[PDB]
Amino acid sequence: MHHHHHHSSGLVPRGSDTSKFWYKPHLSRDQAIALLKDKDPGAFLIRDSHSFQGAYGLALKVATPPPSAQPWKGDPVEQLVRHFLIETGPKGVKIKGCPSEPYFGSLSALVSQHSISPISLPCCLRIPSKD
C-alpha cells in the first residue's frame, strides 16, 4: 500500500434490510411487469393494490403459468408475470388466490418463508437480494 490510514473511515455493513429492494407501492401493473421482464423467474416485487384497500399487489415472474404451455395465446412475458394480492385483514396478510395459505402478518414473514413454503406462489419465491 502506498499509505496506511488508520481504519476509521470504514463502516461495518451487514445489510439484512431487503425490504426496499422488493417493496415499492408506487408502481402499477405495467410498471411491475416492466421490472419483471428483466427478472429471472422467481423474483418478485410488492406494491400496493389498486383493487382493494389494504391489499398489496404481489407481482411474481413465474417460469410458466399454463396447464400445458403448448397452446399459447397471450403476451409472452406479461402472461409469465403473475399478479396476486396480499390482503391484510384484522388477522394479517395472505395471498389471494390460494385457499391453503395462513395469515403471516408482516410481509417479511412471507418473504422469508419463500423457499420454505411457496404456497400461493406456483414458483418458489426468491428475494432479489437473497436467494
From Swiss-Prot:
Induction: By high glucose levels in differentiated podocytes (at protein level). Changing residue 94 to Q: Does not affect affinity for PtdIns(3,4,5)P3. It is found in: Cell junction, Focal adhesion; Cell membrane; Cytoplasm. Detected in heart, kidney, brain, thymus, spleen, liver, placenta, lung, skeletal muscle and small intestine. The modification Phosphoserine is found at residue 129. Transmembrane segments: none annotated. Ubiquitinated following sequestration in cytoplasmic aggregates with SQSTM1, leading to proteasomal degradation. The modification Phosphothreonine is found at residue 64. Residues 22-129 form the SH2 domain. The SH3 domain mediates binding to phosphatidylinositol-3,4,5-triphosphate (PtdIns(3,4,5)P3). It is also required to ensure podocyte integrity while the phosphatase domain is dispensible for podocyte maintenance. Belongs to the PTEN phosphatase protein family. Tyrosine-protein phosphatase which regulates cell motility, proliferation and muscle-response to insulin. Phosphatase activity is mediated by binding to phosphatidylinositol-3,4,5-triphosphate (PtdIns(3,4,5)P3) via the SH2 domain. In muscles and under catabolic conditions, dephosphorylates IRS1 leading to its degradation and muscle atrophy. Negatively regulates PI3K-AKT pathway activation. Dephosphorylates nephrin NPHS1 in podocytes which regulates activity of the mTORC1 complex. Interacts with AXL. Interacts with SYK; leading to its phosphorylation. Interacts with SQSTM1 (via PB1 domain); the interaction leads to sequestration of TNS2 in cytoplasmic aggregates with SQSTM1 and promotes TNS2 ubiquitination and proteasomal degradation. This is Tensin-2. The lineage of its organism: Eukaryota, Metazoa, Chordata, Craniata, Vertebrata. The chain holds residues 1135 to 1249 of 1409 of the full protein.
